């Protein structure tokens, strides 16, 4: 019965500002804290601000002082979250959660429901076609060979092979994002180690966000 | 403000899980334990060090004393598999603190160490001045791994990067980690080292 | 629930 | 789907001693839920699953009579069985019945059975009809015709489609959590090399109930059953089941055979590849 | 008429070192009823070992299941004796980590 | 009249890890002369074994010493395993590293 709902996040660029908006229902919000606790995709969780009851104080984490703002209206029944010079280093996953007790002046006890929150990403967007380098086998069992599709954005890259005729030991990668903002994608096919040169092997990397098709041939040596 | 969580538990199931959140004198503060399954909000499983919210079952316990909190989870479920928080507030921080998480993994599988995948920089790369290191990792199990890059002996601290774990068609776990350089460093070393541990053992290339 | 008797041969 | 219960009693005659061993164990679907044991101190029927000891003195009392006394016809029946095969008294012989019910997916009724056994041998048993008996050897025939004079195919049927599937709808609601549960296989593939040229490709399933499963190789969606192994189904101790079948593999093409894993708590068949 | 047990010797999960396991040996498709079992921490008769109560297949023949609590080290090999009237010697099978 | 055989299991050199050692089987005291004796590398009988030759005490007391080399670790643990006349079932005495 008790709701949480986050909003306003998406895709931001560096610089710019960006409000967090996150909707109650299901207890009296002008009685309880609420909480904002974000997580960057494969990491754990972090304490980001959080807010008593009536607004009254404002508690921040060192890592988002002076940059960050959390609110709420208790008219509304609105936890609100706002991020000015947003950076790369705040793409994360911003959960909104409701403190356990009532009337604490200040954030100490568990948090007991938690919003399904939403995803901020800041980057230097603009689409980009993916260069695609032949990672070739080695020359000295198992033989291993593959595509290298670099600096890519936005997603996604899709890769087959032989236009698709290849499928045993094909496997694709999750895509690295660099530090510069652009994705990284690598996909290789096991074979067998002998037998490699008689067939005709070519990669055909897709990306359509930036309408871009690739074929490389990959060969050793 | 330091509380420090085990990176990965696996355990068969319906035996006894138990994952530790140590920290100075944590004993003296409330702990709390939150589970996150893929994709979803975390979810109250154990708070004040030991109590259990209403639909929590019985199974899981929690515990707190001296320097070391414990979440115990008796008769394993597979579904139990989950990253799990634990919480403090540090009053003499005006912070709340979570733990690193752990990664509880309840196995189907038996365990299988990565097979790491070594690749140089291509010439096609090297002609655009530009060199990178790909090494892949592939078919372990839990999936929980940490990459080290060595040039010759010595650490590599920046311009590496490590994908996150995931599953397999055979649902084992693979990731991949680069290593960004330019074309001069490639040629500096003798010889370059992908180094992945996995469950205490090491496996390089 | 068993059967209620039994069967000789 | 359905479900289904069923009951098996073993009586073995012990030679110089009167009472034989007797042990009747009940299951429902794959879940066993009570066990009599001739030398258990218990002399009571016990219980094996956690759903049924919520039934009370009135039921675990007449449980025991009903198979005190199904015991005892059996020591009888060892003994006239003895005289219809000219048997000695210084042998051992197994008295094996089994019977229970199937019910359908709305409670109804479905199918009844009753089989009984003299050393591993088919000796009498309930035709599909409820109405019939048929008899394996000679011997069974003359507990055939006597049974027709008593109504024994009738009197079966008030049981398999009275009391019998009412235990069977009343178990399944009260333990709706053990055995009303789907178990889909956790599966993983194993690689041995035997020879220089050919190695074993294993494909296993463990943790999965029920216990109906259906491993199969193929070889460039052709189907194998030639290299094939396959294991029956091994308990897993605790309430689950474990299966593995393997292939021999010439080295090299492993990626051509594709093992195939179907099960009831499996939304759609698995594959599994090196 | 008589037949001769198939056995099987596996862990209840996949074994790991150090973590305790249990040690099953199932055998079935036997007849008659009368046979020994036991469990075998190198070439030592395993003592805390319980079986399964005697019910029997489509075809009659029974089946049982001895289990133990065991942890698995990487030295330690374990094995089950089952002997029977069918066998003239007992028969052991070796618990193997992948079968 | 029949003696049932005293065994002693040593090594031939105080054991150290990583070290050709050889590991003895020393039965004596028994009666009549028909013994068997195996060594057993984690329950397995050790197959390059020899023995000594048949020679007897004051009280006509038969002995032999079973050998075999072996190279000790830790995990590895060794035994001898001992079946007589006297003997209903077969005698294990594990080898220690301090006994």
């Known amino acids: 019965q008790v709701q949480l709902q986050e909003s306003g996040g998406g895709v931001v660029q560096p610089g710019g500002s960006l409000r967090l908006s996150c909707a109650a229902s299901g207890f009296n919000f002008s009685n309880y804290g609420m909480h904002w606790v974000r997580q960057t995709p494969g990491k754990g969780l972090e304490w980001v601000a959080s807010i008593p009851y009536d607004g009254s104080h404002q508690w921040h984490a060192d890592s988002v002082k002076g940059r960050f703002t959390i609110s709420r209206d208790n008219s509304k029944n609105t936890l609100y979250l706002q991020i000015n010079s947003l950076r790369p280093e705040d793409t994360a996953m911003y959960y909104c959660?409701?403190?356990?007790?009532?009337?604490?002046?200040?954030?100490?006890?568990?948090?007991?429901?938690w919003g399904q929150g939403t995803l901020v990403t800041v980057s230097s967007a603009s689409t980009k076609g993916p260069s695609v380098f032949p990672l070739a086998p080695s020359s000295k069992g198992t033989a291993a060979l593959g595509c290298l599709v670099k600096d890519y954005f936005p997603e996604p890259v899709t890769v087959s092979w032989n236009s698709g005729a290849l499928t045993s030991g094909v496997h694709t990668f999750p895509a690295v994002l660099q530090s510069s903002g652009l994705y990284s994608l690598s996909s290789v096919v096991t074979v067998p180690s002998s037998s490699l040169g008689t067939q005709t092997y070519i990669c055909n990397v897709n990306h359509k966000p930036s309408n871009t098709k690739v074929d490389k041939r990959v060969e050793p040596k | 403000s330091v509380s420090t969580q085990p990176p990965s538990v696996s355990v068969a199931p319906g035996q006894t899980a138990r994952i530790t959140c140590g920290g100075n004198?944590?004993?003296?503060?409330?702990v709390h334990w939150y589970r996150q399954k893929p994709g979803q909000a975390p979810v109250l499983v154990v708070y004040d060090n030991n109590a259990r919210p209403s639909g929590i079952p019985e199974r899981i316990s929690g515990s707190n004393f001296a320097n070391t909190a414990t979440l115990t989870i008796s008769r394993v479920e597979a579904g139990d598999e989950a990253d799990y928080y634990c919480?403090?507030?540090?009053?003499?921080?005006?912070?709340?603190?979570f733990g690193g998480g752990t990664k509880l993994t309840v196995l189907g599988q038996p365990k299988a160490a990565p097979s790491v995948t070594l690749f140089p920089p291509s010439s096609e790369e090297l002609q655009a001045n530009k060199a990178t290191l790909v090494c892949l990792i592939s078919d372990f199990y839990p999936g929980a791994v940490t990459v080290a890059w060595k040039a010759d002996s010595s650490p590599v601290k920046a311009g590496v990067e490590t994908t996150t774990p995931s599953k397999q068609s055979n649902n084992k776990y693979a990731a991949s980690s680069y290593l960004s350089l330019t074309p001069e460093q490639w040629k500096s070393h003798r010889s370059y080292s992908c180094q992945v541990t996995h469950e205490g053992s090491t496996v390089e290339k | 629930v068993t059967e209620h008797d039994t069967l000789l041969y | 789907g359905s479900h289904s219960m069923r009951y098996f009693f073993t009586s073995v005659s012990r030679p110089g001693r009167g009472e034989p061993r007797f042990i009747a164990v009940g299951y429902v679907d794959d879940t066993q839920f009570v066990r009599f044991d001739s030398d258990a101190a218990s002399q009571k029927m016990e219980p094996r699953a956690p759903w049924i000891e919520q039934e009370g003195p009135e039921y675990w009392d007449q449980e025991t009579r009903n198979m005190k006394a199904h015991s005892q016809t059996d020591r009888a029946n060892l003994g006239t069985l003895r005289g219809y095969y000219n048997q000695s008294e210084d042998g051992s012989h197994t008295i094996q019945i089994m019977y229970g019910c199937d019910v359908g997916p709305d409670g109804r009724f479905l199918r009844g059975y009753r089989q009984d056994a003299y050393d591993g041998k088919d000796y009498i048993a309930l035709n599909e009809d409820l109405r019939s008996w048929t008899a394996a050897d000679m011997a069974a025939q003359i507990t055939k015709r006597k049974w027709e004079a008593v109504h024994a195919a009738e009197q079966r049927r008030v049981y398999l489609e009275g009391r019998c599937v009412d235990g069977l709808r009343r178990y399944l609601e009260n333990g709706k959590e053990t055995l009303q549960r789907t178990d889909p296989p956790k599966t993983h593939m194993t690689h041995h090399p035997i020879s220089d040229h050919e190695a074993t490709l294993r494909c296993w399933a463990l943790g999965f109930y029920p216990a109906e499963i259906t491993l199969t190789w193929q070889r460039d969606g052709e189907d194998q059953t030639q290299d094939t192994e396959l294991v029956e189904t091994r308990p897993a101790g605790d309430g689950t089941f474990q299966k593995w079948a393997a292939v021999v593999v010439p080295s090299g093409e492993e990626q051509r055979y594709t093992c195939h894993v179907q099960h009831e708590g499996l939304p759609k068949p698995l594959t599994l590849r090196w | 008429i008589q037949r001769t047990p198939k056995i099987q010797v596996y862990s209840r999960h996949p074994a790991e070192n150090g973590k305790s396991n249990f040690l099953n040996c199932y055998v079935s498709g036997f007849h008659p009823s009368d046979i020994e079992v036991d469990l075998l921490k190198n070439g030592e008769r395993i003592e805390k070992v319980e079986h399964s109560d005697l019910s029997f297949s489509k075809d009659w023949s029974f089946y049982l299941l001895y289990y133990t609590e065991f942890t698995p080290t990487e030295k330690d090999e374990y094995a089950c004796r089952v002997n029977h009237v069918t066998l003239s010697q007992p028969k052991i099978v070796k618990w193997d980590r992948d079968m | 009249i029949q003696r049932t055989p005293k065994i002693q299991v040593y090594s031939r050199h105080p054991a150290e890890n990583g070290k050709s050692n050889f590991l003895n089987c020393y039965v004596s005291g028994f009666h009549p002369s028909d013994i068997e004796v195996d060594l057993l590398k984690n329950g397995e009988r050790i197959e390059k074994v020899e023995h000594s030759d048949l020679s007897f005490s004051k009280d006509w007391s038969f002995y032999l010493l079973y050998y075999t080399e072996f190279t000790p670790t830790e995990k590895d643990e060794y035994a001898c395993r001992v079946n007589h006349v006297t003997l209903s079932q077969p005698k294990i005495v594990k080898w220690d590293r301090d006994m």
């Open positions: 004198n944590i004993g003296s503060k409330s």
């Open positions: 919480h403090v507030w540090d009053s003499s921080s005006d912070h709340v603190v």
């Open positions: 959660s409701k403190a356990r007790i009532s009337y604490l002046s200040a954030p100490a006890w568990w948090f007991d429901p």
